[PDB]
Design a protein around this nucleic acid. Structure first.
Ligand SMILES: [Mg+2]
Ligand SMILES: [Mg+2]
Ligand SMILES: [Mg+2]
Ligand SMILES: [Mg+2]
Ligand SMILES: [Mg+2]
Ligand SMILES: [Mg+2]
Ligand SMILES: [Mg+2]
Ligand SMILES: [Mg+2]
Ligand SMILES: [Mg+2]
Ligand SMILES: [Mg+2]
Ligand SMILES: [Mg+2]
Ligand SMILES: [Mg+2]
Ligand SMILES: [Mg+2]
Ligand SMILES: [Mg+2]
Ligand SMILES: [Mg+2]
Ligand SMILES: [Mg+2]
Ligand SMILES: [Mg+2]
Ligand SMILES: [Mg+2]
Ligand SMILES: [Mg+2]
Ligand SMILES: [Mg+2]
Ligand SMILES: [Mg+2]
Ligand SMILES: [Mg+2]
Ligand SMILES: [Mg+2]
Ligand SMILES: [Mg+2]
Ligand SMILES: [Mg+2]
Ligand SMILES: [Mg+2]
Ligand SMILES: [Mg+2]
Ligand SMILES: [Mg+2]
Ligand SMILES: [Mg+2]
Ligand SMILES: [Mg+2]
Ligand SMILES: [Mg+2]
Ligand SMILES: [Mg+2]
Ligand SMILES: [Mg+2]
Ligand SMILES: [Mg+2]
Ligand SMILES: [Mg+2]
Ligand SMILES: [Mg+2]
Ligand SMILES: [Mg+2]
Ligand SMILES: [Mg+2]
Ligand SMILES: [Mg+2]
Ligand SMILES: [Mg+2]
Ligand SMILES: [Mg+2]
Ligand SMILES: [Zn+2]
Ligand SMILES: [Zn+2]
Lengths: 69, 91, 62, 114, 149, 50
RNA sequence: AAGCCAGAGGAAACUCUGGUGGAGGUCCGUAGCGGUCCUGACGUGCAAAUCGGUCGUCCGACCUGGGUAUAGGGGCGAAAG
RNA sequence: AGAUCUUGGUGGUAGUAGCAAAUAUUCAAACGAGAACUUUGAAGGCCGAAGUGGAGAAGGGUUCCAUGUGAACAGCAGUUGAACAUGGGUCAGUCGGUCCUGAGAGAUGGGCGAGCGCCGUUCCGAAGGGACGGGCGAUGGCCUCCGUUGCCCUCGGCCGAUCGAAAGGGAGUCGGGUUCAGAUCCCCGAAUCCGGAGUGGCGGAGAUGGGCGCCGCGAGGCGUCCAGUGCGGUAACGCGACCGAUCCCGGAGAAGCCGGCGGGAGCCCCGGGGAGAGUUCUCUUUUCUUUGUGAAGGGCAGGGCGCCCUGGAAUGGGUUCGCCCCGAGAGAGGGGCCCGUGCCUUGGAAAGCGUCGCGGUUCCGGCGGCGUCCGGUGAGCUCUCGCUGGCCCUUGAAAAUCCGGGGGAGAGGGUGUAAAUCUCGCGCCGGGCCGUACCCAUAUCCGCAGCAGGUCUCCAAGGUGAACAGCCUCUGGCAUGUUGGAACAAUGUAGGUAAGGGAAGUCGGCAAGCCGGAUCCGUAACUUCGGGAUAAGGAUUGGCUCUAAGGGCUGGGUCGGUCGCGGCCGGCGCCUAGCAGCCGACUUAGAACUGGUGCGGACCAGGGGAAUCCGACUGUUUAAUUAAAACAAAGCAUCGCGAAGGCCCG
């Protein structure tokens, strides 16, 4: 698994052709976005829910946006 | 304190093998496990690796010497004789 | 309960010892602890300027 | 306490059967079969005993899948010979060539003197 | 293993192609790593040099002497041993030498030999002292040691 | 053993297949003269020659 | 055991003492290997050689798996046919 | 009628010997015609982690798993079974084989041989059938240009086929779930190695800057010329790539045994916080259980360095348990590299686990709540990593395979949004064949058998203790070893005790008994000076209450002269005979009190001395009557032999 730090990197690696799905996990203290690419599961951790909601609205269409809860 | 009166290094052999045999092997074991002064680097770090092979730990120089001593009397006299024959050949 | 008594010294005695004194507490381990404790003290005295190099080195050999 | 079993059919404590203890997310202790300890390259000089620096110490067949940089040093003979012996060889080459020039000059002036 | 005399790896240059030739000379006593040895007719008299017995002086001693011209060393190979060059005659190109057994032998003047004594010194001086040490000595040699009368 | 070769496994397979009782209807054949399978083999009584 | 440190005694030569160190086909003794005695048990046995206690050795000429080589007047034998 | 006759059958013996090695069973119930033996529950015990536990190799071959039967078999029985019958069960790129060579085996050439053949393994061989390179052509064809095909030139010693290890070498799979029986193989989820990609999959790198004539307010643009096979650091070396062949060099693969230390982990121990149990006659904030984070990445600790720079050290210094190190560059200061199995993070909590509840889908990876916490110690045990030593007339594999360097034959473009090329990032495709169940042993193997024998390994808790000893216990396992019941005669086998005497017994102290641990003393002759030696001999040993000694961490300021009740410098001070607080292992010594003199209270655990003979010692030996004084041994001595040779095979 690979860890992403910046938001635009996650966006560009989520709009890849081989991105199977995106799983959104809501923890007590952060939100994890896990995009399932061909080789790695890229995880991006966001500590604040307003940025989490902004990213959730900014996710690309046509891709599974499965949520773990 | 002094631990043995006379056996010294062959105290490891106990009462075995005979006093004359232990006395004979004592000098050889002392010379075989002694550390000589390396003639290449000047350090007292030249010690025996195998029989006839003497390695210096400092300058990593390996010399072909005697079985128990670093060099043998026959080897030294022969080297001097060869040097004299060479100086006669040149002269 | 018996460990608490033994830390106070009970059940140690002479008739409770089966191993040799060196088997119960090795001399080398006692010496090893002693050297480390005293070398640490001499070192800490050297960089606290309580002793110089020469007093340290003579005491180190002592 | 919990006792462990081999996970493969090799049942002897051979050099290729070395294991370490691992705790799983399922809270059990298991063997993980370890790879052998790799060695850094030894200097090509053959005289000094230390192993080369800046080179990753892995098993030989792992070097196939490493990057070029992780297998050598940015220097002449780098990744094959040590810096000290490279300096010695540079100095030795230069000085022996200079001695060749010296001998050539000496014999030329000897022939001129004749 | 099984030999009391050390062996010397000597690396030469191939004179006909770009290559390095590694030899396995018997170590003459006194040679050291990083030392240059010289082999040939014009080699100088130094310990470890190899040169034909015909060119050597009348009293030199040699280490790995050829029994016949052309082969490699055959004589005086065991540790501490040496042969002595007694005499020459350039007619018939012959040289008399003395072998470690004390016997004299006439050989061709073209036989090469290493100058000096072979290393390994007085290996037989030390008593073995132990049936175990005799066992370890002959285990590296061959199955001969426990000798039933 | 657990480690076995293909030929050994095939030989054991044939032995296992042929170690079974006769079908019941064989005894009803005309001029049968066979009562049971005399070539039955138990793993503990008789070991295979292999 | 060697090697090493300190102290003391000495006019010297040197000696003595206390530590450290950890050698050895070293000792006691497990597992292992072996097999002394009871001339014990058993002796149509558990066993076509086993069992109990007692024993020898237990860093080495040590114990052991697998792979190999040596075949009958031949092998192999620290040797008892 | 005979032949210790051959084959087959049958008696007495005789309902006899016997079903006695490894402590042990009991109560109730179920099923069932039937229960000492099956199953369940409750007790009492045993193995006691060097197991009667959990898993493998060899071997077995279906014994594995369900259901059924009750003939035979399981030396009593059986409702049970490793029996019998009917069905079922072994899933792989990454676990092995497969590949490599080892000791060795073995063709061909050659030699021998009546001959099947056997000798030999580089030797008496024209032993390379391969190659990016260049040329000559076929333009084979998307005939631009690049791929094939034939020949020639040049280069090319594995110098020898082949086989040989399921424990050696050998790239790369882990976590969770799942079955009646399979899983590192199935499912779920996370990875990873190797191979391929011609038409080139996408990016990034190469690589895209200077000079001059000008235009143009500047900036920025047009033309021409010139570069451009990366860059940084004094250095160790670093950065994401970083053109390059034949050839050469080197490394890894690739190394013994033993000792002592140090780091890390797993386990063990202690102090708390939860959750669930146990005791509660009295006491017990108590006792027990439980209290996760894989591979692979990134970061950071930690360990190591015989790596670098400054500098120049005797009044020598640094330093270890030991050592050892230094003008060939110490100490000190600053760096670099390797390992990183430890911690954090992605994986990750969604899973797992512990508890508390709620639904149904006859046999839901159901649903939900809470929790999965904070610490401390160590000559502890086991792995592992590292450092430093010792020992050797012993020096402790090879080859596949992979890599780095040297060199520069070549190739690439004319300044373009460029080329050759790329060990950089991501993407695409594939990984065939065989093995895989189970037992692995007081019942799945060998010994005629469910045989007290034999049979190679891995893991390893608490107490006592020197201890992987013995004894007791927890996890896990079992039912006492192919039967039970009732009695307690002789004789036995195994184990004890015995007044007084103490070897009078006997061939003979055979057997048994005495001694035994540790502490403090004390130890002779003789000696090869090492030993003898635990010589011999003597005293002590419990319990309880204390005392003393033996460590580690922090903090050692005289203060507003001031504001970033807190600091940047200093007027403003003297722990310097060292204090203050905090924390923590066992060990040793001394004392008092005390018990019916008993205290190594079980377990563990040397009888001793004086001589004689032999063998020096340690070792070995007649598997199955001889373990010895026999053999071996080091030491000593003799003999042959300089290779067309000595000894030996054929
Ligand atoms: Mg972990
Ligand atoms: Mg003999
Ligand atoms: Mg059988
Ligand atoms: Mg011994
Ligand atoms: Mg002993
Ligand atoms: Mg008997
Ligand atoms: Mg006889
Ligand atoms: Mg008749
Ligand atoms: Mg009867
Ligand atoms: Mg009976
Ligand atoms: Mg018990
Ligand atoms: Mg078992
Ligand atoms: Mg079954
Ligand atoms: Mg029966
Ligand atoms: Mg059956
Ligand atoms: Mg060839
Ligand atoms: Mg093969
Ligand atoms: Mg293997
Ligand atoms: Mg299974
Ligand atoms: Mg985790
Ligand atoms: Mg320094
Ligand atoms: Mg949870
Ligand atoms: Mg299995
Ligand atoms: Mg048995
Ligand atoms: Mg049989
Ligand atoms: Mg019984
Ligand atoms: Mg019974
Ligand atoms: Mg049985
Ligand atoms: Mg009496
Ligand atoms: Mg009496
Ligand atoms: Mg009498
Ligand atoms: Mg009498
Ligand atoms: Mg007796
Ligand atoms: Mg005596
Ligand atoms: Mg008392
Ligand atoms: Mg004897
Ligand atoms: Mg004698
Ligand atoms: Mg024997
Ligand atoms: Mg016998
Ligand atoms: Mg006997
Ligand atoms: Mg004699
Ligand atoms: Zn030197
Ligand atoms: Zn070097």
């Amino acid at each position: 698994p690979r860890k992403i730090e910046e938001i635009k990197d996650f966006l560009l690696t989520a709009r890849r052709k081989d991105a199977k799905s995106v799983k959104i996990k809501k923890n007590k203290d952060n939100v994890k976005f896990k995009v399932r690419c061909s080789r790695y599961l890229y995880t991006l951790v966001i500590t604040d829910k307003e940025k989490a909601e902004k990213l959730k609205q900014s996710l690309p269409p046509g891709l599974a946006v499965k949520e773990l809860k | 304190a002094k631990r043995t009166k006379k056996v010294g290094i062959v105290g490891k052999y106990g009462t075995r093998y005979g006093a004359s045999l232990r006395k004979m092997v004592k000098k050889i074991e002392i010379s075989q496990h002694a550390k000589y002064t390396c003639s290449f680097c000047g350090k007292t770090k030249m010690k025996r690796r195998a029989v006839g092979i003497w390695h210096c730990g400092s300058c990593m120089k390996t010399v072909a010497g005697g079985a128990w001593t670093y060099n043998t009397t026959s080897a030294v006299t022969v080297k001097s004789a060869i040097r004299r024959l060479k100086e006669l050949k040149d002269q | 309960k018996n460990t608490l008594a033994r830390r106070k010294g009970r059940h140690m005695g002479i008739g409770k010892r089966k191993g040799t004194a060196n088997a119960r507490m090795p001399e080398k381990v006692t010496w090893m602890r002693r050297m480390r404790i005293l070398r640490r003290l001499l070192r800490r005295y050297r960089e606290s300027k309580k002793i110089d190099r020469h007093m340290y080195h003579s005491l180190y050999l002592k | 306490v919990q006792r462990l079993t081999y996970r493969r059919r090799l049942s002897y404590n051979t050099a290729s059967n070395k294991t370490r203890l691992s705790r799983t997310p399922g809270n059990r202790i298991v063997y993980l079969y370890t790879k052998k300890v790799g060695k850094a390259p030894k200097s090509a000089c053959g005289v000094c005993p230390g192993r080369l620096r800046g080179v990753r110490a892995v098993r030989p067949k792992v070097l196939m899948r490493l990057s070029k940089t992780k297998k050598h040093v940015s220097r002449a003979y780098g990744g094959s010979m040590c810096a000290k012996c490279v300096r010695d060889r540079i100095k030795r080459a230069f000085l022996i060539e200079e001695q060749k020039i010296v001998v050539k000059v000496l014999k030329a002036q000897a022939q001129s003197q004749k | 293993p099984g030999r009391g005399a050390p062996l010397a790896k000597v690396v030469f240059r191939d004179p006909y192609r770009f290559k390095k030739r590694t030899e396995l000379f018997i170590a003459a006593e006194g040679i050291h790593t990083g030392q240059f040895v010289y082999c040939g007719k014009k080699a100088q008299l130094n310990i470890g040099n190899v040169l034909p017995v015909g060119t050597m002086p009348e009293g030199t001693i040699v280490c790995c002497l050829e029994e016949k011209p052309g082969d490699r060393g055959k004589l005086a190979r065991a540790s501490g041993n040496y042969a002595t060059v007694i005499s020459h005659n350039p007619e018939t190109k012959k040289t008399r030498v003395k072998l470690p057994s004390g016997s004299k032998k006439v050989i061709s003047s073209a036989n090469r030999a290493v100058v000096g004594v072979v290393a390994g010194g007085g290996r037989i001086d030390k008593p073995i002292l132990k049936a175990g040490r005799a066992y370890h000595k002959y285990k590296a040699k061959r199955n001969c040691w426990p000798r039933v009368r | 053993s657990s480690h076995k070769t293909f030929r050994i496994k095939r030989f054991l397979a044939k032995k296992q297949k042929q170690n079974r009782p006769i079908p019941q209807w064989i005894r009803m054949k005309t001029g049968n003269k066979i009562r049971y399978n005399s070539k039955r083999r138990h793993w503990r009584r008789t070991k295979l020659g292999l």
